């Protein structure tokens, strides 16, 4: 297969996983010092789709409004797309697992923007093989002095 053919196939796998919302190979656990986390129940291989960070897709004005009212945990994921700020707001309690995944700067998932015909989705891709029983972790990416003073776990 060519690079394009491999990319096409991966896109098709991802699109179909976004659509099904299929969230296999993961479960909730209580992890010391973190509250809930999500742990692998099967091995994931480097590059596998893991899960969508799924919630309410919103623009910046609404995201500010909502965060003024929340300030309730932190389940808001900001990103840039076509020169504008969006947010995936996962505050509302659902059975979706991406929202329960905890933070590490040296985790095992990497968030990627995935476009489907003009609608942006935030997806987690395994950045290395992930062992059964290990906690899923990605970088939340807030390095601000204000946040880290209050939440030193952001530093690690």
């Amino acid at each position: 297969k060519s690079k394009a053919e491999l990319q096409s196939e991966e896109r098709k796998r991802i699109d179909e996983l976004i659509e099904s919302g299929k969230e296999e190979g993961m479960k909730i656990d209580l992890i010391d010092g973190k509250g809930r986390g999500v742990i692998a129940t099967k091995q994931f291989s480097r590059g596998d789709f893991v899960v969508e960070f799924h919630g309410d897709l919103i623009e910046i004005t609404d995201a500010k409004k909502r965060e003024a009212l929340y300030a309730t945990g932190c389940y808001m994921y900001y990103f840039q797309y076509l020169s504008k700020t969006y947010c995936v707001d996962a505050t509302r309690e659902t059975n979706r697992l991406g929202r329960l995944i905890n933070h590490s700067k040296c985790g095992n998932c990497q968030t990627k923007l995935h476009d489907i015909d003009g609608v942006p989705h935030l997806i987690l891709i395994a950045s290395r093989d992930i062992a059964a029983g290990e906690e899923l972790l990605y970088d939340y990416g807030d390095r601000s002095k204000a946040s880290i003073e209050a939440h030193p776990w952001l530093k690690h």
């Binding site: 300030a71 932190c74 994921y77 900001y78 990416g141």
Partner: peptide, 8 residues
Amino acid sequence: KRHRKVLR
């Protein structure tokens, strides 16, 4: 009191 997540 709060932090966010930011795609990087």
